[PDB]
From a paper:
DExD/H-box RNA helicases, from virus and bacteria to eukaryotes, play important roles in processes including ribosome biogenesis, RNA processing and folding, ribonucleoprotein (RNP) remodeling, RNA nuclear export, the regulation of RNA translation and transcription, and nonsense-mediated RNA decay. DExD/H-box proteins often contain accessory regulatory domains and localization modules, but their cores consist of two RecA-like domains joined by a short flexible linker. The N-terminal domain is commonly referred to as conserved domain-1, or [name]-domain, and the C-terminal domain as conserved domain-2, or helicase domain. Both domains contribute to the binding site for RNA substrates and both contribute to ATP hydrolysis. We used X-ray crystallography to determine the structures of the [name]-domains of DDX2A, DDX2B, DDX5, DDX10, DDX18, DDX20, DDX47, [name], and DDX53, as well as the helicase domains of DDX25 and DDX41.
[name] ([name]) is required for the release of snR30 (small nucleolar RNA-30) from pre-ribosomes. snR30 is one of three snoRNAs that are critical for pre-rRNA processing in yeast. [name] ATPase activity is important for optimal pre-ribosomal RNA processing, but not essential for release of snR30. In the crystal complexes with either ADP or AMP the loop closes up, resulting in a shift in Cα-atom positions by up to 3.5 Å between the ATP- and the AMP-states, or by up to 2.5 Å between the ADP- and the AMP-state. Thus the conformation of the P-loop is determined by the nucleotide phosphates, and longer phosphate tails result in a more open loop.
Author numbering: 137 to 327, 330 to 378
C-alpha cells in the first residue's frame, strides 16, 4: 500500500486501467506469489539481474494476471525480460502443442536478439524457442503436419504473414496464448502493419489468447489503437 505507492512513485511507473495488479518489488516475490520454475529464477539471478527494472516490476504481474497490456519504456529498460518471464511462467513446461507464444519484432536483427535472450534465460528448462528461417519455411518444418514439439516463436510481421498465407498454411496459431508486439511504435510508423496485425490476431483462435504491445515511446496511435482494439487494456509507462 505505502509499499506499493512507493514502488510506483520512486520508479516512475505510470499506470492506467481498471483492476490493476500490484507491481512486484523483487524477483523473489515471484517464487512466493506465482511459484516460478526454480531453474528459471536461478537463471535470472545468475545473469546478474538482481532486481527487476521498473517496466518488469509492473509489466510482469499484468501479464501473469492475463491482462492485455500496452507497455512503454525507453530503450535500455529491460522490455525483453518484461515479456519473456511471464510467457515462460504461463507456459509452465515445454509441450508438444505447437507454438503457444508468438513475439513479433520489426527486423531479423531485433528478433535474433530476443531469441538469444530467451534461449539464455530458459537454459535447462527444455523450452524450444525458434525463429523460422527461409530453409525451414521451404521445409515446412513447423507446419501443422509436423511434430509440434516447439513452444515459442520469435519473428517479423512479413515472415509470419508469409507462413499464414502459404497454401496450405506453413504455421498454425491455434494454441498461441500470448501474442507480443515488440517495438510497436516503430512498426506503426514503418507500415499496413495495422491490417497485418488484424489478420495475425484473427488466426490466433485460442480461448486463452492475450495481447501485449511493447514500445519505446508512449505514442498516440499505438495508445488509441490499443484502447480501441485490446480488451480492458492496462497501460504502463515509465516516466523519464
Ligand atoms: N532486471 C535486470 N537487471 C539488470 N539488467 C537487466 C535486467 N533486465 C534486463 N537487463 C539488461 O538490460 C539491457 C537491455 O535490456 P533490453 O531488453 O534490450 O531493453 P529494451 O528492450 O527496453 O531496450 C540488457 O543487456 C539486459 O540484459
Ligand atoms: Mg528491446
Amino acid at each position: 500500500s505505502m509499499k506499493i505507492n512507493f514502488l510506483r512513485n520512486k520508479h516512475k511507473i505510470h499506470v492506467q486501467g481498471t483492476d490493476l495488479p500490484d507491481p512486484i518489488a523483487t524477483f523473489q516475490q515471484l517464487d512466493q506469489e506465482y511459484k516460478i520454475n526454480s531453474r528459471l529464477l536461478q537463471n535470472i539471478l545468475d545473469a546478474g539481474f538482481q532486481m527487476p527494472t521498473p517496466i518488469q516490476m509492473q509489466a510482469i504481474p499484468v501479464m501473469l494476471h492475463g491482462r492485455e497490456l500496452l507497455a512503454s519504456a525507453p530503450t535500455g529498460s529491460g522490455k525483453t525480460l518484461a515479456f519473456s518471464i511471464p510467457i515462460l511462467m504461463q507456459l509452465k513446461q515445454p509441450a508438444n502443442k505447437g507454438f503457444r507464444a508468438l513475439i513479433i519484432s520489426p527486423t531479423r536483427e531485433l528478433a535474433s536478439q530476443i531469441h538469444r535472450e530467451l534461449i539464455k534465460i530458459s537454459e535447462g528448462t527444455g523450452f524450444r524457442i525458434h525463429m523460422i528461417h527461409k530453409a525451414a519455411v521451404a521445409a515446412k518444418k513447423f507446419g501443422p503436419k509436423s511434430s509440434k514439439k516447439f513452444d515459442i516463436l520469435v519473428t517479423t510481421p512479413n515472415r509470419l504473414i508469409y507462413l499464414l498465407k502459404q497454401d496450405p498454411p506453413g504455421i498454425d496459431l491455434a494454441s498461441v496464448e500470448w501474442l507480443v508486439v515488440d517495438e510497436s511504435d516503430k512498426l506503426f510508423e514503418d507500415g499496413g502493419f495495422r491490417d497485418q496485425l488484424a489478420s495475425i490476431f484473427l488466426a490466433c483462435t485460442s480461448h486463452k489468447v492475450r495481447r501485449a504491445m511493447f514500445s519505446a515511446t508512449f505514442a498516440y496511435d499505438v495508445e488509441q489503437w490499443c484502447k480501441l482494439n485490446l480488451d480492458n487494456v492496462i497501460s504502463v509507462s515509465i516516466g523519464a
